[PDB]
Structure formats: C-alpha cells, structure tokens
Amino acid sequence: KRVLYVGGLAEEVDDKVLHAAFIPFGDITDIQIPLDYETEKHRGFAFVEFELAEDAAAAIDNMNESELFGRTIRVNLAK
Amino acid sequence: GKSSKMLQHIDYRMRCILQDGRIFIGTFKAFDKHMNLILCDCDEFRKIKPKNSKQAEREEKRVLGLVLLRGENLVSMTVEGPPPKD
RNA sequence: AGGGUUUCCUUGAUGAUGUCAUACUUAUCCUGUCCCUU
RNA sequence: AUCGCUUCUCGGCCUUUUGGCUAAGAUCAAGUGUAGUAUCUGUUCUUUUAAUAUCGUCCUCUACCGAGGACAAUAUUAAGGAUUUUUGGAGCAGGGAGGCAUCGACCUGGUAUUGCAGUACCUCCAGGAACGGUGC
C-alpha cells in the first residue's frame, strides 16, 4: 500500500524535476517513470514514494492541479 | 526415514554446546556426516547462557563471526532463536 | 476578427504437470476339438 | 351469416421412398490365451569404481590443404559395510589444599669474547629471587 499511481503529468519533467518539486513536503524514497524505449521519452506520468504517509498526504493536497505543469493530476494506490 | 531432524533447524539461530563446556551461538547453515557445523554470525559464551540474569546476561562474550566447528567436539544443540531474514 | 492539464511496471525468452498398473478387448494363436450322474 | 387470429379433428399431395445382374451370386461355425491400449489412481522434479566407443604436437606420403599412425585425459552407471563423505576409531577419565618436587628466563655486582651470520638455550664468578609456568 506504499506504491501510488500518479497520472496527468505535464510532459517535460524527469526524475530530477520530480525530486525537486516534491521534496519540500518530505523525504522521498523512490521515483519511477515508465519509459517508451522506441521514443526514449516517458509516457506522461510517474509514481513518487514518500518516506512518510503524512507527507504524501500533504503533497496530494498542495500539488494536485498544481502550477508550472498547470494541470490536474490523478493519484491513487497503484495496486 | 526422514533425515530432517538436522535439516529442520537449518537457517535457524542455534545454541551449541562444546565438549570443554563452551557455548557457541550462531546461525546454523550447514552440517555433515560427522556433524561438522557451519555457524554464521557466531559468538562464544563461557560463564552463562542467560535466562534473564538480573545482574547481567553476558560475561565473557566474544564475537567470532563465520565458524566451522568439528563434530568430534560437539555435544548438543538447541534452538536459540528464529532465522534472521537477510 | 477571440488562448490553455490524471500511467498497476513498462519484452529481443536453451524443463514442466506427469507415470505405472490393471483390466478389457486383436492383422496372433493356438484348436479340429468334450464334460458330468441311474 | 361475413372477415381475421388461435386450439381440434380429418381428407387430398405424401413413387418426396426401397437406385441393377448372376449359380435365393456363394457359405454359415469356436474357444482360449496373449498382447496392446486405454483409463484410473497415486505420487515425484527444478534452481569413487566397472564396461563400451573416439582440440594441441611430432613423423611419413600427395597436390597451405587431405589421409595414416603415437602421445596428452574425456563420457556413461552403481556405493547394496572394505581406505576421500551415508552403516562409525573411538571411548572413558580431573577434582584437591590454602607446603614439596622440576624447568625456565631474571635481577644485582664484577669478568670474557672483536670472529663474515639464518638460531631449543648460549661467557663466568659471586650474591639475590615478598618471579613466572606444571603436577601432587
């Protein structure tokens, strides 16, 4: 119940951008970005795992539908 | 029949008693015909096997590490604790 | 003559279900063949 | 009465149906035992020795290639107890007391040795041990 599915991601950001954008809410243990090896680019979404669930919660509240990307994101248990 | 009586305790933490009267506690990983034993993360005790001795539980404890004990000098074994997961 | 946001992971691939025993019907196996009481 | 739908009975089509011939074409019979196939029931894998067979180098022949011989271990199977594993060579034996024996450095004085080595120890003479180990 530690892995989350994060969709609706604006196209440009990589794992470094994600780390920088979410670390203000708390320490992060993992960042996964599915790739399309034919294009070498990501598919527009990623999963960010926080060390603490409370921090993951604060991130959802402040980042969903957030600026820079300027769009609404979808977050839920991955499985 | 089953041969399991040793194989059951394999991977477990085991308290082994030597012929001089020492206590070797380690992770029981292997044995053989002679009862030569392979003990991972093994320590030696001399004075006591603690059952919560209010004064202290541990005196003359020595860290050994990876130990191969010859079966000639083994007397007996009991289960000390479950396998470490690692 | 006018403008805007939600992916369970996501391959270039030299072990898997068997086997054995018993019972019921031939392109083999052998027949030219018999019992039982007053 | 007439028109339409639905039960129910019945008539006519139903050759839409038996698609040849010959000596009714001819003849008229069985049991047992094994082997093979199919089905059902029950339970197993992966992550030393014995037997058989046959890339490198050297030599010879013929036009780097080919053939022939020799040499260097390799592969398979089994462990029903005989040296490297699973039918055992192991076993049994330690407290006692609160001085005695033995060995070894050792500590003081003094004294000898001046030579090219791989080491139980290493001059000797006198004194000193409230020293160390082991056994009873």
Curated annotation (Swiss-Prot), chain A:
Substitution effect: residue 38 to A: Slightly decreased affinity for KMT2A
Protein name in the entry: Peptidyl-prolyl cis-trans isomerase E
Cleaved signal peptide residues: none
Subunit structure: Identified in the spliceosome C complex. Component of the XAB2 complex, a multimeric protein complex composed of XAB2, PRPF19, AQR, ZNF830, ISY1, and PPIE. Identified in a pentameric intron-binding (IB) complex composed of AQR, XAB2, ISY1, ZNF830 and PPIE that is incorporated into the spliceosome as a preassembled complex. The IB complex does not contain PRPF19. Interacts (via RNA-binding domain) with KMT2A (via the third PHD-type zinc-finger).
Lineage, top ranks: Eukaryota, Metazoa, Chordata, Craniata, Vertebrata
Residues of the full protein shown: 5 to 83 of 301
Outcome, altering residue 5 to A: Decreased affinity for RNA
The record's note on its domains: The RRM domain mediates both interaction with RNA and with KMT2A (via the third PHD-type zinc-finger), but has much higher affinity for the KMT2A PHD-type zinc-finger.
Family, per entry: Belongs to the cyclophilin-type PPIase family. PPIase E subfamily.
Subcellular location: Nucleus
Listed result of changing residue 47 to D: Abolishes interaction with KMT2A. Abolishes inhibition of KMT2A activity
